[model samples]
Target: VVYTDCTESGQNLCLCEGSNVCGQGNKCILGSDGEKNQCVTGEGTPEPQ
Candidate 1:
């Protein structure tokens, strides 16, 4: 499971290969460029916005 705090400091846009610590307002977003996982804004899905 992923845990995102979504804080400014934790506003990370990327995650390490073996790391798993997402901050507030952000969720784990899968990458498409064969890269590692990343943390995106969890402000809810775009359709709701």
Candidate 2:
């Protein structure tokens, strides 16, 4: 999990899940770096290939 502090909410926080997708009742957090961005999940695969 990642945390951020900014003028607004949900800022400066980006994380990635170890596995594939986020399942039901879960979510994927996203954020950006100085020159890049990322996302994270907390669940099993949400879809198939």
Candidate 3:
């Protein structure tokens, strides 16, 4: 299993290979372009204002 910490670093974008779980405010999704899977921030979450 993969574990991605969705902290303030890297715009909360984490790369998940397989069976990976994202940290708070983020979720795992199957990617295109042979990405397999990746962790990213929620749609409702906005960057620094």
Candidate 4:
């Protein structure tokens, strides 16, 4: 399984492969650009937000 790798650094934007470590204001978001999971704003479908 993927461990939560979200943080306030650059990972705050294109988060490290996505999970749910951005547990504050941002959330993890998936895209369709052949990329890994990223952190997005306004909360979304990940885990802790």
Candidate 5:
């Protein structure tokens, strides 16, 4: 899961989720450093195996 501080009125300072979907023209991926993941817009990322 991931947490975001984007909300204003939660009990915790942040919120979490199981997963997030990428917007159109972007892709959800494991970050290159292998720690955090995010939605990125690029040309060469491969399809999941």
Candidate 6:
């Protein structure tokens, strides 16, 4: 499976946008390192502590 970077929203992790075929696929969240957002698999979890 190929996970694609969604968009930058905020420091908080957000759900992936545009039917990204996640879950049994690329189901993940969008997070950033004070730079840009990227595809990350973190459900019910925090991106950066």
The candidate scoring highest on TM-score is 5
Comparing 1 and 3 by lDDT, which wins?
A: 3
**Residue by residue across 23-42, what tens digits does model 3's lDDT show?**
34764454546545555556
lDDT of 1: 0.41
User: By summed lDDT, which 10 consecutive residues of candidate 3 come out lowest?
Assistant: 6-15
Order the candidate numbers by TM-score, best to worst: 5, 4, 3, 1, 6, 2
**Runs of candidate 4 exceeding 4 Å displacement:** 1-20, 30-35, 44-49
lDDT of 5 by residue, 1-49 (tens): 3334322211121221224434234444444364554555544322322
Rank order by lDDT, top first? 4, 3, 1, 6, 5, 2
Question: Over the full model, what C-alpha lDDT does candidate 3 score relative to the true structure?
Answer: 0.42
C-alpha local distance difference test of each model: 0.41, 0.32, 0.42, 0.45, 0.34, 0.38
Model 6 spans > 4 angstroms off: 1-31, 44-49
Candidate 3 residues lying further than 4 Å off, grouped into runs, are 1-20, 31-35, 43-49
Pairs in clash, predicted candidate 2: none
Per-candidate TM equals 0.29, 0.22, 0.30, 0.31, 0.33, 0.24
TM-score computed on alpha carbons, candidate 6: 0.24
TM-score of 1: 0.29
Q: What are the RMSDs of all candidates, in order?
A: 8.9, 11.7, 9.5, 8.0, 12.4, 8.7
lDDT-wise, the better of 4 and 6 is 4
For model 4, how does the per-residue alpha-carbon lDDT over 1-49 read when each residue is reduced to its tens digit?
3445533333333344434354245655454365555555664443325
* Model 5 CA lDDT for position 17: 23
lDDT of 5 at 45: 29
Model 2, span 1-49: residue lDDT tens:
4332222112222223333332334444432443332343344332322
Question: How displaced is residue 9 in candidate 5, in Å?
Answer: 32
**Distance from true position, residue 15, model 3, in Å?**
12
Q: Using alpha carbons, what is the TM-score of model 4?
A: 0.31
